[PDB]
Amino acid sequence: MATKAVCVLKGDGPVQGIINFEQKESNGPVKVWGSIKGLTEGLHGFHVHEFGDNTAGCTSAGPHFNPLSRKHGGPKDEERHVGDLGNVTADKDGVADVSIEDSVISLSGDHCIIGRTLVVHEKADDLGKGGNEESTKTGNAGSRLACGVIGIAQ
């Protein structure tokens, strides 16, 4: 049904952004693109979380969206959360230019991410390869800097 979606990211700090999603075929991949500003230079975990609940800011978004009950990985791993979109990279000006294609998320059906929350994190996602409990759950990406509900777009 939905072929386009959009998310406005905001937080308590300076991190702000707009991410676009496009899926021209229901059984095809989703392109995810846009820009995030206000970030510290370097890598930042970038995940779809389960709830589109911003009533307590990014905290009420709950955990990584994981309907298949897998362990956390990078977006190229077979073992991954549906929500695991890896890292975005901020340049020296604090701007991350996002350009991702993904085959696991969907804008329709059981992996559908409309109505869930996109979150950019304080630290790099260790892609589930950090050798501890936390790595297998969250990637050690730490704090939530900005988030927004993924909405249907024209």
Query: 64 among the known binding-site residues?
Result: yes
Catalytic-labelled residue, pool 72, 102, 116, 126? 72
Q: Is 64 a catalytic residue?
A: yes
Q: Is 111 a catalytic residue?
A: no
**Hey, which residues between 44 and 83 contact a copy of itself (CB under 8 A)?**
50-55, 62
Count of CB atoms situated within 10 Å of the CB of 63? 14
* CA distances to 32, 57, 98, 100 from 103, in Å: 11, 29, 16, 10
Q: Is 81 a catalytic residue?
A: yes
Judged by CB under 5 A, the stretch of 5-13, 15-23, 34-42, 78-86 that binds Zn ion is 78-86
Per DSSP, helices labelled H in 40-89 are none
Question: Of a copy of itself, ligand 5FW, Zn ion, none, which one sits near residue 116, judging by CB under 5 to 8 A according to partner kind?
Answer: a copy of itself
SS3 letters for 85-113?
EEEEEECCCCCEEEEEEECCCECCCCCEC
Residues that bind a copy of itself (CB under 8 A): 2, 5-6, 8, 18, 50-55, 62, 114-117, 148-154
